[PDB]
Amino acid sequence: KNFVISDPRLPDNPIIFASDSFLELTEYSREEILGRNCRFLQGPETDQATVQKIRDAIRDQREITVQLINYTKSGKKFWNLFHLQPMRDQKGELQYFIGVQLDGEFI
Secondary structure: OOEEEEOOOOOOOOEEEEOHHHHHHHOOOHHHOOOOOHHHHOOOOOOHHHHHHHHHHHHHOOOEEEEEEEEOOOOOEEEEEEEEEEEEOOOOOEEEEEEEEOOOOOO
């Protein structure tokens, strides 16, 4: 499946794991993704109203589903439908965010 994990307990919430199909879809290698915030997939056509909603969901630690324009390494635009989900530990404390993508371009 197609997903990434970020660690919000590290500066600027970096990606610490990416599945192989996410690498294939974005055309990036694992070593140029790990340790970065996911926002590098954004570009000029990305809807800022939608980015705001993600920012608010991360702040409130709520699950959200969104669609937005992202860019592969070679600069190809694609519609990315991904669902964001908080992952808490046993004490109810936030540990990770997981982002699960539809394994292909969209409408």
